[PDB]
């Protein structure tokens, strides 16, 4: 239905500190008498458009910035309008992450990257490179433990390895991401997955490993290392393990390039509580008291809010997140992110499982992520056609002239490519 007025409803991922966010909401209600409800629906990043397009959904949506362009494209997000002095409190490159088409579509909360997380009792000196991890595993498996376990289901986790030797999402230049050019099936993306797949293929990891399995084992001292993000620290803290958070390893000599996320608060285009959500996010959330409330539940990363980031950037754990974040790229916010993440999700999982070989998996992902005009191969023959026709159409047609088409030869050649083009698809 239509969202409820006089009420703020909030979606944030269940791996984030929502009980803390709930406590900011309580401070809001205690103060403004306006109740606040914090839920964490599963597959949140998909369900929001599913209902925010019908006028439903939450007043406030909490996700990384990479999904929010697709939402703004389909006008699911109200344009946010803080004053100048409020955006001076947030690092401006975080705002950059939430400017779509020169409009601000979200409040940036915190910068997130993946770091390496390892057991020091099990492993006092963490691998500096991926290629040394098989050995680490063979030596640890002899003591009943194992080297690495991080969650293969989500591509977010396996990406910094793919990006290492030169995979990317889309090519960025001139202020624009080229949605037609996708670096997921190059040499330095096949090589990274083939490594992961070989980890699997060699019983060094396990293709079924998800977030819970990997979190469980590392925490119970069963595996020496994990890959995960700031939100995950407050459970090792409440675990026996004497952990270190550190720079990710390197592949083929190159560092792991994580896709940096900026947890963002999006207001729903359909919310009749927009002015109420501004007040919540600007005056209760993006306060040190607000952000600490969240950050004490599960850690937020490097918050976007300068004043609180000063106390935060002292954490050696934050430093290592920021080390890795600066070794990766900010995620783009363009609507093609989802086709990108779906393609990589499919490729990795299918390679990891065996239904697809690696080259099969990333070929498929090349095309599923590219977004190409059907006759892209033949643009060079249309260009030389079009020139002939536009010349005919202007000079021997629009002004009346008869003589049948002088561009029949080029047409039929292009007609041939575009007809093999359609056939290799649908």
């Amino acid at each position: 239905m239509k969202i409820e007025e006089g009420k703020l409803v909030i979606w944030i991922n269940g791996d984030k500190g929502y009980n803390g966010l709930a406590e900011v909401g309580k401070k809001f209600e205690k103060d403004t008498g306006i109740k606040v409800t914090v839920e964490h629906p599963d597959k949140l990043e998909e369900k929001f458009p599913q209902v925010a397009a019908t006028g439903d959904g939450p007043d406030i949506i909490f996700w990384a910035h990479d999904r929010f362009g697709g939402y703004a494209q389909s006008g699911l997000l109200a344009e946010i309008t803080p004053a100048a002095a409020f955006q001076d409190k947030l690092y401006p490159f975080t705002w950059d992450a939430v400017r779509y088409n020169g409009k601000l579509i979200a409040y940036p909360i915190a910068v997130e990257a993946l770091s390496l997380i390892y057991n020091k009792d099990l492993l006092p000196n963490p691998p500096k490179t991926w290629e040394e991890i098989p050995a680490l595993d063979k030596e640890l498996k002899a003591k009943g433990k194992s080297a690495l376990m991080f969650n293969l289901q989500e591509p977010y986790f396996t990406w910094p390895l793919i990006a290492a030797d030169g995979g990317y999402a889309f090519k960025y230049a001139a202020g624009k991401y080229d949605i037609k050019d996708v670096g997921v099936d190059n040499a330095g993306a096949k090589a990274g997955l083939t490594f992961l797949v070989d980890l699997i293929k060699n019983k060094h990891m396990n293709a079924d490993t998800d977030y819970s399995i990997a979190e469980a084992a590392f925490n119970k001292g069963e595996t020496a290392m994990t890959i995960n993000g700031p939100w995950a620290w407050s459970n090792i803290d409440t675990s026996a393990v004497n952990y270190g958070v550190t720079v990710l390893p390197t592949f083929k000599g190159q560092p792991s390039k994580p896709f940096v996320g900026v947890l963002s608060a999006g207001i729903n285009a359909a919310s009749p509580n927009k002015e109420l959500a501004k007040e919540f996010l600007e005056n209760y959330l993006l306060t040190d008291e607000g952000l600490e409330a969240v950050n004490k539940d599960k850690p937020l990363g490097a918050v976007a809010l300068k004043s609180y980031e000063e106390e935060l950037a002292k954490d050696p754990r934050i430093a290592a997140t920021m080390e890795n974040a600066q070794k990766g790229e900010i995620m783009p916010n363009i609507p093609q992110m989802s086709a990108f993440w779906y393609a990589v999700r499919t490729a990795v999982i299918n390679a990891a499982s065996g239904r697809q070989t690696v080259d099969a998996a990333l070929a498929a992902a090349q095309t599923n992520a590219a977004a190409n005009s059907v006759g892209e191969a033949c643009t060079d023959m249309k260009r030389e056609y079009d020139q002939c026709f536009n010349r005919w159409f202007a000079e021997k047609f629009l002004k009346g002239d008869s003589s049948g088409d002088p561009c029949t030869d080029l047409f039929k050649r292009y007609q041939q490519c575009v007809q093999k083009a359609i056939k290799e698809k649908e």
Binding site: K2, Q50, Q73, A371, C378, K382, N390, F393, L398
Partner: protein, 165 residues
Amino acid sequence: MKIWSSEHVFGHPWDTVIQAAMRKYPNPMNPSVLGVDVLQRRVDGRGRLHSLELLSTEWGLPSLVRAILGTSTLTYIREHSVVDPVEKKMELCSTNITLTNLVSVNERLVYTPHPENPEMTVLTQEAIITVKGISLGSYLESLMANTISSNAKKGWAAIEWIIEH
């Protein structure tokens, strides 16, 4: 089985606005149009150019159903155009080829000179959304009304970007 209409006026002769519309896409005023492939061109007994073009699109309203639907992407547009230079009239009907069964959206454009003569062009536009499983909702429809009205308005700007080249 809803509508969205319009009647824009271009500030150039009919000839140039048609020369434009015939080399319209792809072009920077509408980056959701990934490219246009001309499948068949014929002149009829009356001297009218018939083209069948298949467009490659992105964030148009058949993607709005991918929201309610669940997962998909690229949407293809069948287009039949007829230009009669004697009658000074350009016609153009289009449909979505993919992500149909859900929704079908039929646009129709007619370029023609202003009836008072000022060497200016007037374009008459309409879009016909039909859907099986007629859920919609005024909100979703307004979204659809809004995104239709933007490709519309971006299509014109795409003309001006061409005729000023």
